[PDB]
Amino acid sequence: MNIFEMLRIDEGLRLKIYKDTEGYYTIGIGHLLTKSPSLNAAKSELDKAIGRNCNGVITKDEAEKLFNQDVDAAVRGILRNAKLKPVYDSLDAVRRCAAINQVFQMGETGVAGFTNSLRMLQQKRWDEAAVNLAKSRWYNQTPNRAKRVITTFRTGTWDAYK
Ligand SMILES: [Cl-]
Ligand SMILES: [Cl-]
């Protein structure tokens, strides 16, 4: 298992514009296009990202290409955050995949206000972090996914991904 396979499992793959669980236009492998409710802004954004007139549809390759850049951006985002970097660098490789997944899903922003859990993960208080993390809108809105990421942080293994 690796980050791509884990996220490809959590986000799925769709080649036609779609609305995510928050109702926002997305495409590919969880690639958020825009928060606006105008399908047209969404398509403009898509064309701009891909580099061609897509008409709301892309290829697998284009999808994978956007996914590559998004994983990259997520990690770089972590590395550049002063509150995140130190935590991330303290974790083992499996758990680092769990950190990337959260940031890919919620942004550097979302994740940066999990201060208490961050502290707990840094101190390697797994079970404690796990209970804390569940006390969140993230877990209540997308519990099956949140459960899988939380178990990954708690155990350091890929068992939730079986
Ligand atoms: Cl792009
Ligand atoms: Cl879910």
UniProtKB/Swiss-Prot annotation:
Effect of residue 26 to H: Facilitates transglycosylation more effectively than hydrolysis; covalently bound substrate
SUPFAM superfamilies associated with the record: Lysozyme-like
A GO biological process held by the record: cell wall macromolecule catabolic process
Stated consequence of mutating residue 20 to E/Q: Loss of 99% of enzymatic activity
Effect annotated for changing residue 11 to A/F/H/M/N: Complete loss of enzymatic activity
Binding site for substrate: 32, 104, 117, 132
Induction: Expressed late in the viral replication.
GO (cellular component) term, any one: host cell cytoplasm
Keyword Zinc-finger attributed: no
Active site: 11 (proton donor/acceptor), 20 (proton donor/acceptor)
GO molecular function terms attached to this record: lysozyme activity
EC number: 3.2.1.17
Keyword annotations: Antimicrobial, Bacteriolytic enzyme, Cytolysis, Glycosidase, Host cell lysis by virus, Host cytoplasm, Hydrolase, Viral release from host cell
Cited CDD domains: T4-like_lys
Recorded consequence of changing residue 11 to Q: Complete loss of activity
Effect of residue 117 to I: 500-fold decrease in enzymatic activity
Superkingdom field: Viruses
Impact when changing residue 26 to E: Complete loss of activity at neutral pH; covalently bound substrate
Catalyzed reactions: Hydrolysis of (1->4)-beta-linkages between N-acetylmuramic acid and N-acetyl-D-glucosamine residues in a peptidoglycan and between N-acetyl-D-glucosamine residues in chitodextrins
InterPro entries attached to this UniProt entry: Endolysin_T4_type, Glyco_hydro_24, Lysozyme-like_dom_sf, Lysozyme_dom_sf, Phage_lysozyme-like, T4-type_lysozyme
Influence of pH: Optimum pH is 7.3.
Primary role: Endolysin with lysozyme activity that degrades host peptidoglycans and participates with the holin and spanin proteins in the sequential events which lead to the programmed host cell lysis releasing the mature viral particles. Once the holin has permeabilized the host cell membrane, the endolysin can reach the periplasm and break down the peptidoglycan layer.
HAMAP family tied to this protein: ENDOLYSIN_T4
Family note: Belongs to the glycosyl hydrolase 24 family.
Name of this protein: Endolysin
Organism of origin: Enterobacteria phage T4
